Amino acid sequence: LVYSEAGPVALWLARVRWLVILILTGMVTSSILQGFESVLEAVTALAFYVPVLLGTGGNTGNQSATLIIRALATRDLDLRDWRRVFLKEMGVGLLLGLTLSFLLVGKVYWDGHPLLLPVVGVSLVLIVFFANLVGAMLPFLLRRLGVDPALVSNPLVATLSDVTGLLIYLSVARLLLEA
Amino acid sequence: LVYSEAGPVALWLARVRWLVILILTGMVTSSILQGFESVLEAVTALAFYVPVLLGTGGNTGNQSATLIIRALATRDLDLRDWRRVFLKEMGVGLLLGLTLSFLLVGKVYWDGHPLLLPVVGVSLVLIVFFANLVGAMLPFLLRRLGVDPALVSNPLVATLSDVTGLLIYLSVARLLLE
Ligand SMILES: [Mg+2]
């Protein structure tokens, strides 16, 4: 409604539902991390890079979403184009992944964690790649469902990327460090 | 920049610079966590709640920002109305913080870390409270600086919430676990 004419309790009632849904979805991350407690306890430094990994996926996805939302609005793209966009973006995400990975591997090299060099390097590439597709396709899904991306797309991409990003990161870590 | 006529390489060049800046800025969080390696070592379960703590903050901040950006764009609010918003959002942020904290506390108890009930519980309240303020004020700071908030708020709020969110969580953890 109108912010100028809404009270604190009113704003709370208007915002709480969507935040409760998101956190209930976000709680899964804590379950995912606990399931990988063996690798986490063995190599403490794995925890150090969780925000950057997931945060970079969130940036990448939401950057992708903003582009697709704009194109659909201006009728530069139609709903039927989601497959063509999917095929092109998977090429864009790979390039973005390899680029950003190079920088983060350098950071890990600086911090002095040689075992995490391939772990963080591989994972970020996959994270940026998958976060990019999710960000690219989500506006197509919301337009089809009749939902407006404005207050929905950004946190959805971020929460989905956190969950997917953790699953990728921790699996790579397990495979390379515990196997 | 027309998307339908732009190739993969073209899209790549037009996107990297902003993503490169964001990850370089984001690297701060990595150093922050290393500075609190002591508590991370002491309690492993401390790391289990980092993404949900920072994620909830980012969502909270993006929400309040999106509301303010809309109010300023539709002339529902003036730039000079920042103080009124700030005072109102203190109440909204507290209520939101208390509500979400109650839920996350249940999850910590579900996960089986009663040790982490107070630290995670208090932290989310503080995180939501401050993330909501950052979100509500950033459009005001941006427009006053000659930059429309709708273009750059979302990456900014997420990064600020991650950095400040970590600092709150880990400092609370340090005080109560050490
Ligand atoms: Mg985030």
UniProtKB/Swiss-Prot annotation, chain A:
The residues that the entry says bind Mg(2+) 6 are D148
Binding-site positions, Ca(2+): E5, E41
Q: What is the effect of changing N154A?
A: Does not affect activity. Increases Ni(2+) sensitivity
Enumerate the Periplasmic topological stretches: 37-45, 112-115, 174-179
Q: Where found? A: Cell inner membrane
Binding of Mn(2+) 1 occurs at: E5, E41
Q: Which residues cross the membrane?
A: 14-36, 46-67, 82-111, 116-139, 151-173
Q: Where is the signal peptide?
A: none
What happens upon changing E89A?
A: Abolishes Mg(2+)-transport activity
**Record: residues binding Mg(2+) 7:** A158, D162
Q: Which residues lie on this side of the membrane: Cytoplasmic?
A: 68-81, 140-150
Q: Where does Mn(2+) 2 bind?
A: Q34, E37, H113
- Please explain the role this protein plays, according to its UniProt record: Highly selective magnesium channel that plays an important role in Mg(2+) homeostasis. Functions as a Mg(2+)-dependent gating channel. Exhibits low activity with cobalt, suggesting that it might also be involved in the uptake of Co(2+) as a micronutrient. Also exhibits low activity with Ca(2+), but it shows almost no activity with Mn(2+).
Query: Hey, which family's this protein in?
Result: Belongs to the SLC41A transporter family.
How does it associate, per the subunit comment?
Homodimer.
Protein name, please? Magnesium transporter MgtE
Gene name for this UniProt entry: mgtE
Q: Which residues of the whole protein are included?
A: 271 to 449 of 450
